[model samples]
Target: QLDIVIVLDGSNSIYPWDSVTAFLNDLLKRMDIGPKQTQVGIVQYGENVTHEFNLNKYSSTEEVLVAAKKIVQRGGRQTMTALGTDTARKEAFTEARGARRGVKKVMVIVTDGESHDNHRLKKVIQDCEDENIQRFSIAILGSYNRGNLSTEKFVEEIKSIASEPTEKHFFNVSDELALVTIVKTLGERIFA
Candidate 1:
């Protein structure tokens, strides 16, 4: 039904990686995942981006879940979020990666903070839209909130990165632990 590529921010900013994977597992568990159904891909990014798995790597939900478990944090000094989305747009959805021509393509971006190259995001986001990729942007504000730093700009940038109708495509959580709360809502939206 869909080809999903989850772009995760794996920079040092993400306090604990466990929460991200847990949110992933919780979300994927509800889907009817299969080769003919929803196929998932993962692109984890920090100072650099790495494809943990391509869309075609696993045909079953259980296998995908296990693969998700093995994905340890890829630490880096910077959060290159724009590069992550751009890479996903260019490489993650190709037929070689098990992306079907007619299946809807979706990109879910999970990040705890802003990107170092955030200035380059407008064009990158346009590229994704031009390719007909639906995006879901989730911003985890725990770090900023804990540090008492102003998150106004972070919220603005993340919101702008989402597709039109912000309410439908955007989400923000106080912390990683609260990520699970949105699982059902996000799952329904994706599978709808």
Candidate 2:
């Protein structure tokens, strides 16, 4: 089984939460439900980090979907960015690190803007690089300048700290419809 940790940014910067929800709903819509083969957990952060749910925390996807539907929008810009405090983030990484035990570990961080918390995201990601754990990033497009999103400016930072070159492992979803493609790519790479 795989431990899939989805760190969702529940801040006000999430302009189209419906799309995010749709993306998640689509993920749950998939058939072949086998808890033995795959496990999922959700971590949300706005003013603070919240563990929405963890794998086996429930019996079925419907229960998790009910919890996901309860997520409301937060205000005051993107605070507690990078998901949580440095300690919490590290603890999460360690949790995900140990969650899967002998299986592959994947942490999918979904965010809109930069980090507001003091957590050094790059350092945390780089520090966790090992043979077992694999990290991925999904930076949703908000009102930021798209020009500021080139390889040198945006991706290079990810590459410097990521396990590999980090380009293939990173994705940006500017349109709502792209969310499906993003999740599909992630599933294909990890589970296919």
Candidate 3:
């Protein structure tokens, strides 16, 4: 069994808001969710952080899907990725919130923009690691209308945020559709 938290970026700078919702919907559908299997949660961040749900809140796939549909865009201009990560680490993954004992604790971060506080993000991710949380980062880059994303600037930091075997933990994609393919790969990695 696994306890997974999806840290999604809700910054206004993210292109194509519909795509984000669609990606989330598809992602929720792909997971094997249940009380006895994998449990899921969400933490959304923009200029502020929101605990959309906790790890043990939903006991079935349909419940998770219903919750995922309610996730609206926060539209904040700044991406406070680090602060949200800290919130997920400290607030979302608690025993009270249903984080299971003896199960793998995984965090999947999906961000279209670079973090406003990169320095703080590194420290927070390290703190999560010290507590045995596995971290993965998906960096969205180069959508047609979004112009050329400068992956050079944030690639190293993205790699640093992910767990060992950075190549396996870090995913670089051009658009939301690509995110759908990643879910299967992530499941394989997690279950392996």
Best by lDDT: 1
| Steric clashes per prediction | 0, 0, 0
Q: What are the C-alpha RMSDs, in order, of all predicted structures? A: 0.9, 3.8, 1.9
Superposed on all Cα atoms, model 1 deviates from the true structure by an RMSD in Å of: 0.9
| Candidate 2 or 1, higher TM-score | 1
Q: Write the per-residue lDDT of candidate 2 for residues 1-192, one digit (tens) a residue.
A: 666666677776566787788777766555222356565667777777776766546546677676667666554466454444232245544544335456566666666665654356655554556334576677666435443543334333433333454666777666545676776666676664
Clashing pairs in 1: none
lDDT by candidate, in order shown: 0.90, 0.59, 0.82
Model 1: lDDT of residue 170: 95
Could you tell me how far off, in angstroms, the CA of residue 7 lies in candidate 1 after the best superposition? 0.3
Per-model TM-score versus the true fold: 0.97, 0.76, 0.91
Instruction: At residue 191, give the lDDT of candidate 3.
Output: 68
Write one digit per residue (lDDT tens) for candidate 3, span 43-95. Answer: 99989899899898998988999889888888787778898888889888888
Tens digits of per-residue lDDT for model 1 on 19-95? 88899889988877788999999999998999999999999999999998889998888889999999999998899
Which candidate should be chosen as best, given TM-score against the real structure? 1
Give the worst 10-residue stretch by lDDT in candidate 2. 153-162
